[PDB]
């Protein structure tokens, strides 16, 4: 796979916790992009073998996370994961 390849990954919203920390955001000069910082046990992401820490988040449920602030990214993913009617969650990512 080439650096930064795009990949669409689906994730069920059944678990109460997404179980991920995210890092970065357009205010950051060091990490302008939003990346998965850590995947935590107990959550939904720990169960997806295609999700890894270090992936760049591009979109969630059709909502762009490109060039967004950290605050908007957190808010956008939270709203998507709590929207249980839309199942599964769709995450567009760029792999390292």
């Amino acid at each position: 796979v080439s650096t930064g390849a795009l990949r669409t990954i689906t994730l069920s919203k059944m678990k109460q916790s997404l179980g991920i920390s995210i890092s970065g955001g357009i205010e950051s000069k060091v990490q302008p992009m939003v990346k998965i910082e850590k995947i935590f046990p107990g959550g939904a992401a720990f169960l997806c073998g295609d999700l890894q820490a270090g992936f760049e988040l591009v979109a969630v449920d059709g909502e762009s996370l490109e060039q967004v602030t950290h605050q908007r990214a957190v808010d956008t993913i939270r709203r998507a994961y709590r929207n249980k009617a839309r199942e599964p969650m769709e995450l567009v990512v760029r792999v390292p």
């Binding site: 920390s21 890092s23 205010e27 993913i77 994961y81």
Partner: peptide, 7 residues
């Protein structure tokens, strides 16, 4: 300046 938040 990298922010990290548990989602």
């Amino acid at each position: 300046d990298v922010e990290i938040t548990l989602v």
